[PDB]
Amino acid sequence: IDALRTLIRLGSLHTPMVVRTAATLRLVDHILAGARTVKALAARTDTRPEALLRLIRHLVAIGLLEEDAPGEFVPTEVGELLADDHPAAQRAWHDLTQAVARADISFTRLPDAIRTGRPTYESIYGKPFYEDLAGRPDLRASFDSLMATAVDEAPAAAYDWTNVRHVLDVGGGNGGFAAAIARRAPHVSATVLEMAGTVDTARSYLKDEGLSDRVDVVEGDFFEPLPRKADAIILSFVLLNWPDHDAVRILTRCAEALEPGGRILIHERADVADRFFSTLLDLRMLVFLGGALRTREKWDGLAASAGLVVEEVRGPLVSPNVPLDSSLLVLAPA
Amino acid sequence: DALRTLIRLGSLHTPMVVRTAATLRLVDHILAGARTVKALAARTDTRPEALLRLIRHLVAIGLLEEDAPGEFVPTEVGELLADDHPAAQRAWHDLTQAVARADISFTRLPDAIRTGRPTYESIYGKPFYEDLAGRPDLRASFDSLMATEEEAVDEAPAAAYDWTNVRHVLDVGGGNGGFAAAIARRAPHVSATVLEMAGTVDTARSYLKDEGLSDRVDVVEGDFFEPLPRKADAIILSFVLLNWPDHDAVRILTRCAEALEPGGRILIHERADVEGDGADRFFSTLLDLRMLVFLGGALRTREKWDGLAASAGLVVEEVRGPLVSPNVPLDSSLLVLAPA
Ligand SMILES: CC[C@@]1(O)C[C@H](O[C@H]2C[C@H](N(C)C)[C@H](O)[C@H](C)O2)c2c(cc3c(c2O)C(=O)c2c(O)cccc2C3=O)[C@H]1C(=O)OC
Ligand SMILES: CC[C@@]1(O)C[C@H](O[C@H]2C[C@H](N(C)C)[C@H](O)[C@H](C)O2)c2c(cc3c(c2O)C(=O)c2c(O)cccc2C3=O)[C@H]1C(=O)OC
Ligand SMILES: Nc1ncnc2c1ncn2[C@@H]1O[C@H](CSCC[C@H](N)C(=O)O)[C@@H](O)[C@H]1O
Ligand SMILES: Nc1ncnc2c1ncn2[C@@H]1O[C@H](CSCC[C@H](N)C(=O)O)[C@@H](O)[C@H]1O
């Protein structure tokens, strides 16, 4: 009977949907904003009081809410992470109208991705992942914000920027990694290569950090010739989005733009308790994009195809509000 | 710790990993000789690299273990996904069978919370039982999941009632007729009738025939919202009323009260809603929220049961008991109802 309870709990689809539904309704923020009754809570969220209580009941049973006084539910320690100002952003990561939780519906067709090795995102939303964001500015922004989370300081501190002149952050996102280098290395100029939409939140984030004279942004496709050369080329959580043959192409473009003596830095999670979140990231890449997490041995193959060699891998990098450690692989020409 | 706990709780990928393993019959294929991923992928027609990434999550959640290098075997928990296991959890997690198919309705849980209305129809085009009425594979699958393959999970509610003075039993919505069978084996003088829908009446007929009981239990096709096909002294409603919103349950109960013989009783076999700080609350809200998104139904408290009965001109005499069943993680009760 212990085994039965364990399997039912593990296989249950209603619990993560309860968490996600609570996040989308901003339930915890409404509690913290003074909604002390279910009546108040249903009004602020425009839901049915009878139905909202049945959701609160599961939220209590899984330890996200507690009933303090009768009919008064407040967040627990774990439940407070759904507050919108919490620096782990777990509410937005669970908001069904934001990009990742909406992407997560691709897991409902996991059998197909396991049969074919292809992502299931397109069969649900009409377009592959990044094409879908390209037509949905709310999701583009939303995804950009999730990706962005001060938090990339560990990778930057794991590399000596003494002899680095120009840094190119390929698929750099909102430019936080580039910013973390500029703060660390006062002599480097940096450039972010990013897609439409993103380049403007990158430009605004870089401006508001006071660094728009240290880091420019260029709109482009990193499968095409890169806009310029550099001594350090940054691929922070990019290649895991791509099958082997597309990652080779990206790496090849980086190699063609690498200055003499330069290095390509890959900031990712090497495939090896932590296994729970490793496999969650890895299967996400399967069903969203057709990508994957890769072992060190697999990394040697990809670099070899690109005419590169894995020079070194700098050990586990810990970050705030992040349950998975990171690595920095340094690549050189073959 | 807090961050890791919320992510585990909120993750969609773990239950879909379990459901994918059950749908591929992964555990059965290991149990049947597939010792390598290669042989596993071929038996399931899956990609070896992709099947391994799924296996890796099944190990992380403790459903498989790496015995020898590259050889994965089920754990004691993982063995519950074997097809002959009497709790039938593989079928319950099979995406092509009725309930795991219906669970997709949870992806629209907000709508159900906003409106109090089930979301099954918006995904599949038809209300739950109308969808089964067009899908013989699903109708059959659902009827087998309610039945359990165990002849004796109905014994506790059946042993909680004295069938001494009972002449005819009407099992309204009695599914495959196991509850009716459990009475006839405890009560040799009793005759029973199962009222069920098209398709199900035939699996109840063949189940009762193979139990040797077709001359003690008959089966009638019908709509329990219409006048019932005959009168009776015990009218059984086992796990039916939770499928229906209040107004429909009152209509069902009213039809039951109209068919009740003098001195007879309507028996309700369900889970009585009760506040709890216990581990069983997880499975209580699972059943209750399934009823919301599948059907618009609900689990009900005793207080709520009192109100339903009075609308139907009935009164709850006694609630007979949190009868605990062997190897079932949810408590059932038997409410005894008589006319007001
Ligand atoms: C929850 C852990 C992590 O935040 C690690 C990892 O997130 C880490 C690093 C990430 N990064 C910007 C440094 C950020 O600091 C975040 C708060 O923590 C991660 C995550 C998820 C994604 C991604 C992740 O990188 C993606 O990159 C990604 C992508 O590039 C394209 C589509 C989807 C995704 C992701 O879903 C997360 C993950 O591994 O979930 C299993
Ligand atoms: C796992 C516990 C239980 O089996 C209790 C409960 O199942 C109990 C009693 C049930 N019954 C036929 C006696 C059978 O013995 C089963 C193995 O155990 C239950 C369950 C599920 C359903 C239902 C359940 O009754 C339904 O009735 C149901 C329905 O009538 C129409 C659509 C869907 C469902 C259900 O999904 C289960 C439940 O509560 O899951 C949370
Ligand atoms: N063809 C393309 N050209 C340039 N950038 C691309 C691209 N396809 C995807 N990307 C970018 O790759 C990024 C990966 S996710 C964000 C990564 C960021 N460096 C970080 O570590 O936080 C996305 O921002 C996406 O816009
Ligand atoms: N209008 C209707 N008339 C008769 N039966 C109905 C019905 N609508 C739903 N049902 C039946 O109600 C049952 C609900 S589940 C049946 C549970 C079963 N008696 C048991 O305890 O094991 C299904 O078998 C379904 O066929």
DSSP one-letter string for B140-158:
HHHHHHHH-S-SSTTHHHH
Pick out the residues of the known binding site of B for S-adenosyl-L-methionine. Answer: 139, 173, 196, 223-224, 238
Q: Rounded to an integer, what distance in angstroms lies between the CA atom of residue B265 and that of residue B169?
A: 10
Q: Cα(B150) to centroid of ligand 1, in Å?
A: 46
Q: Rounded to an integer, what distance in angstroms lies between the CA atom of residue A47 and that of residue A25?
A: 9
**Who's near B87: CB < 8 A, 6+ residues apart?**
A4, B80, B327
Q: Which token pair is A49? A: 């009081």
Terminal Cα distance for chain B, rounded: 55
User: Which residues does residue A169 pair with via DSSP β-bridges, in sequence order?
Assistant: A192, A234
Residue B140 beta carbon below 6 angstroms from any ligand 4 atom: no
Residue A146 beta carbon below 6 angstroms from any ligand 1 atom: no
**Who's near A162: CB < 8 A, 6+ residues apart?**
none
The closest alpha carbon to B37, from B62, B22, B56, B23, belongs to B56
- Which fold would CATH assign to domain A2-93? Arc Repressor Mutant, subunit A (1.10.10)
Q: Rounded to an integer, what distance in angstroms lies between the CA atom of residue A176 and that of residue B190?
A: 77
User: Which residues does residue A191 pair with via DSSP β-bridges, in sequence order?
Assistant: A168, A216
H/E element holding A31? helix A27-32
- Which fold would CATH assign to domain B2-92? Arc Repressor Mutant, subunit A (1.10.10)
Q: Rounded to an integer, what distance in angstroms lies between the CA atom of residue A179 and that of residue A117?
A: 36
Q: Rounded to an integer, what distance in angstroms lies between the CA atom of residue B252 and that of residue B239?
A: 13
The ligand 1 atom at the shortest distance from the C-alpha of residue A152 is 13
Cβ–Cβ below 8 Å for A5 and B106: no
- Chain A residues within 8 A of B9 when measuring between CB atoms: 15-16, 19, 62-64, 78
Burial of A124 (0-12, 13-18, 19+ CB in 10 A): middle
- Which residue is closest in CA terms to ligand 3's atom 13? A171
- Which fold would CATH assign to domain A146-333? Rossmann fold (3.40.50)
Q: How many CB atoms lie within 10 A of CB A295?
A: 11
H/E element holding B131? helix B128-133
* CATH architecture for the domain at B147-339: 3-Layer(aba) Sandwich (3.40)
Across the interface, which of B7, B60, B281 has its CB nearest the CB of A323?
B7
- Chain A residues within 8 A of B11 when measuring between CB atoms: 16, 280
CA-based radius of gyration for chain B: 22
Q: Which token pair is A165? A: 């002149």
Q: Which token pair is A250? A: 């990206």
- Chain B residues within 8 A of A243 when measuring between CB atoms: none
Q: How many CB atoms lie within 10 A of CB A16?
A: 25
Cβ–Cβ below 8 Å for A94 and B10: yes
Q: Cα(B243) to centroid of ligand 3, in Å?
A: 47
The closest alpha carbon to B299, from A191, A235, A50, belongs to A50
Residue A100 beta carbon below 6 angstroms from any ligand 1 atom: yes
Minimum CA–CA partner of A57 in chain B:
B285
Q: Rounded to an integer, what distance in angstroms lies between the CA atom of residue A104 and that of residue A98?
A: 10
The closest alpha carbon to B111, from A125, A28, A97, belongs to A97
The closest alpha carbon to A325, from B13, B4, B6, belongs to B4
Residue A147 beta carbon below 6 angstroms from any ligand 3 atom: yes
Cβ–Cβ below 8 Å for B95 and A107: no
Residue B157 beta carbon below 6 angstroms from any ligand 4 atom: no
Beta strands in chain A (DSSP E): 65-69, 72-75, 166-170, 189-194, 215-219, 230-236, 258-268, 308-317, 326-333
Our mutation pick for probing the ligand 4 site, out of B240, B251, B267, counting the most ligand atoms within 8 A of Cβ, is B240
Q: Rounded to an integer, what distance in angstroms lies between the CA atom of residue B287 and that of residue A235?
A: 46
Q: Which token pair is B93? A: 């997690």
**How would you classify the pairing of strands B300-301 and B333-339?**
unpaired
Q: Which token pair is A108? A: 């409902």
The closest alpha carbon to A161, from A147, A178, A136, belongs to A178
A62-70 own/partner pairs: CB under 8 Å, 24+ apart = A62/A15, A62/A18, A62/A19, A62/B9, A62/B282, A63/B5, A63/B9, A64/A19, A64/A22, A64/B6, A64/B9
Burial of B240 (0-12, 13-18, 19+ CB in 10 A): buried
Q: Where are the domains of chain B?
A: 2-92, 147-339
Q: Cα(A106) to centroid of ligand 2, in Å?
A: 27
Q: Cα(A121) to centroid of ligand 1, in Å?
A: 17
Q: Rounded to an integer, what distance in angstroms lies between the CA atom of residue A185 and that of residue A49?
A: 56
Residue B331 one-letter amino acid:
D
The closest alpha carbon to A184, from A148, A154, A145, A142, belongs to A154
- Which residue is closest in CA terms to ligand 4's atom 11? B173
Beta strands in B197-330 (DSSP E): 217-221, 232-238, 260-270, 272-273, 300-301, 314-319
Could you give the 3-state DSSP secondary structure of residue A25?
A: coil
Experimental approach was: X-ray
Contact indicator for B267, B336 with CB cutoff of 8 Å: yes
Cβ–Cβ below 8 Å for A104 and B61: no
Contact indicator for B109, A17 with CB cutoff of 8 Å: yes
The closest alpha carbon to A235, from A266, A192, A274, belongs to A266
The closest alpha carbon to A185, from A211, A220, A221, belongs to A211
Q: Cα(A172) to centroid of ligand 3, in Å?
A: 6
Terminal Cα distance for chain A, rounded: 58
For chain B, how long is the longest CA-to-CA vector? 70
Q: Do domains B2-92 and B147-339 have the same CATH topology?
A: no
| Residue B323 DSSP class | B
- Given CA atoms B125, B128, B134, B136 in this order, what sign does their dihedral have? positive
